Structure 1
Amino acid sequence: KLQFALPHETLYSEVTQVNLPAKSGRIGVLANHVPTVEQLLPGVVEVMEGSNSKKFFISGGFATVQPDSQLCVTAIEAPLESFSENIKNLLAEAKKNVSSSREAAEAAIQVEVLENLQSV
């Protein structure tokens, strides 16, 4: 089974192929996979159940294939399309201001998300 979850919304409850971006680069999981624990980095995630493919922008989290083949994905928030141009423009401006401004760490996130967003 595939748990794709947010605190307020559980998007999925095994689902055929899932492609995830983790602090390990990108990992794709298809059926059985060894039972990993992976920190999910801020991400563009694709989940495929059968041939149907769904595209998610994910705030990072944790990923854990369980030895009972339950892909526990927990993340704070996510769809790709809802997140998706004016928002990017705004994010660029905010990134710049924060760039000048913990404020350093914040700016690092602003750049990271801005790049990840820029990718879409």
Structure 2
Amino acid sequence: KLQFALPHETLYSEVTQVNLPAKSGRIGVLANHVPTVEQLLPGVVEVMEGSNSKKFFISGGFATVQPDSQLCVTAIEAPLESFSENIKNLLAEAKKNVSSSREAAEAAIQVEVLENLQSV
């Protein structure tokens, strides 16, 4: 079972195969899995129910396989196609931001986010 809930939505809140991108690379959960807690990095996420696959762009969060086979995914915001050009313009602004100043870290996250979006 998968429970995917966000502070403004409830998505998948069983689910056949789920692929999640975590600070440990990528983790896939199918049935029982070891009941770890792993922090989700800014991500492209796929959730598959049967063979049907739905693709989510996930802002990072935390993932926890519960020892009862409940995949708790919580993250700040997301479908993938909806996120998708103007942001590519925005990264140019963000590059400028790296130059001036906390803003560096912010802009670094922005570089990660454009890169991740360009990746898909």
Query: TM-score surpassing 0.5?
Result: yes
> In the alignment, which residue of structure 2 is the partner of 1:90?
90
- TM-score normalised over the length of structure 2: 0.92
Is 2:94–2:111's contact at 8 Å kept on the other side of the alignment? Answer: no
TM-superposition CA deviations, 1:60-111 (whole Å, max 9, x none) = 0000000010000000111111111233232333343344431121121011
CA contact (8 A) 2:18 2:30 kept: yes
Tell me, yes or no, if the aligned pair for 2:87 and 2:114 is still in contact at 8 Å.
Answer: no
> TM-score under structure 1 normalisation?
0.92
Superposition misfits of 4+ residues, deviation over 4 angstroms: none
Give the % identical residues.
100
- Give me the whole-angstrom Cα distance separating, in 2, the residues matched to 1:20 and 1:95: 28
* Corresponding residue of 2:4: 4
- Alignment gaps of 5+ in structure 1: none
The CA distance in 2 between the partners of 1:74 and 1:56, in whole Å, is 13
Separation of aligned partners in 2, 1:30 and 1:95 = 40
User: 1:92 touches 1:114 (CA, 8 Å); kept in 2?
Assistant: no
After superposition, the C-alpha distances for 1:36-69 in whole angstroms (9 at most, x for unaligned) are 1000000000000111100000000000000010
Distance 1:14 1:92, change over 3 A: farther
Query: In the TM superposition, what is the alpha-carbon distance from 1:5 to its structure 2 partner?
Result: 1.2
Q: What is the Cα-based RMSD across aligned positions, in Å?
A: 1.4
Shift of 1:26: 0.7
- The structure-2 alpha-carbon separation of the partners of 1:87 and 1:107, relative to structure 1 and needing over 3 Å to count, comes to closer
Q: Which has the larger displacement, 26-35 or 37-46?
A: 26-35
CA 1:94–1:104: 2 relative to 1, 3 Å: closer
Cα contact 1:14–1:69 (8 A) shared by 2: no
